[PDB]
Design a protein around this ligand. Structure first.
Ligand SMILES: Cc1cc(C)cc(-c2onc3ccc(/C=C/C(=O)O)cc23)c1
Length: 237
């Protein structure tokens, strides 16, 4: 993720087939001739897409130019949460499935995985960051506290941002409960709230493993519902 002063991020296409699939996902959703109500609604929950971008002198080098969802924040607090029971896709080999399940064997049980967070602390005027190993450490016993950490600014628990997050996730959940044409594996929700101020963003990202489907995305829904339940329990802290 390259953050550009103009309010965008550049995301480099991952190696094939992942990068190409993500490009084609954005292209389908943001097709200027799209009249599919499901895809038109989905746009609300993605970063705005500004098309494929390559350096003037390097057409080999493929990026997605995307909206920087954090741009309108002063001190953005950022959490990336992978959603679903499976982070392997329907065409994974047995080895690929193990690779993926072994990354976090609780994925089936919990339905989400914190990929990281960046949390502004007011008292120190500083950020604390958690990496992939944080979320992968979390168990049924510690997931609630693990998520809570995102909404603690070193003085209070930001229950406003928690409530706002539930409300925005609910709209995404509603989108998933009214579509049976896409299934999303290893995709994430990006949570942003203002650390320095009620603004909150919850957007879907990471579409290297979105596939056509004829079913509800039950794994994604499970994850959304479990994540909401956790956030809801945090409101009782
Ligand atoms: C500073 C910072 C940190 C992180 C983790 C994400 C972002 C971020 O802000 N707007 C973002 C928009 C998109 C993506 C990735 C999209 C994809 O994989 O499809 C990431 C973003 C910004």
């Amino acid at each position: 993720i390259l953050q550009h002063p103009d309010g965008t991020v550049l995301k480099q296409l991952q190696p094939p087939p992942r990068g190409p699939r993500e490009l084609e996902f954005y292209n389908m959703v943001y097709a200027a001739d799209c009249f599919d109500g499901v895809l038109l609604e989905l746009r609300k929950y993605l970063p705005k897409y500004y098309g494929i971008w390559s350096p003037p002198t390097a057409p080999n080098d493929l990026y997605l130019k995307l909206e920087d969802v954090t741009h309108k924040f002063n001190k953005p607090c950022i959490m990336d949460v992978k959603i679903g029971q499976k982070s392997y896709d329907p065409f994974a080999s047995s080895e690929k499935i193990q690779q993926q399940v072994s990354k976090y064997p609780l994925m089936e049980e919990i339905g989400f995985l914190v990929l990281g967070m960046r949390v502004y602390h007011v008292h120190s005027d500083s950020y604390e960051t958690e990496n992939q190993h944080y979320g992968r450490s979390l168990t049924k016993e510690t997931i609630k506290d693990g998520v809570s950490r995102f909404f603690h600014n070193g003085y209070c628990l930001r229950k406003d941002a928690v409530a706002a997050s539930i409300q925005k996730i609910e709209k995404i959940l509603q989108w998933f409960e009214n579509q049976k044409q896409l299934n999303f594996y290893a995709s994430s929700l990006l949570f942003v709230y203002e650390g320095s101020g009620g603004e909150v963003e919850v957007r879907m990202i990471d579409f290297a493993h979105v596939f056509p489907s004829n079913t509800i995305d039950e794994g994604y829904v499970y994850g959304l519902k479990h994540l909401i339940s956790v956030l809801r329990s945090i409101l009782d802290n």
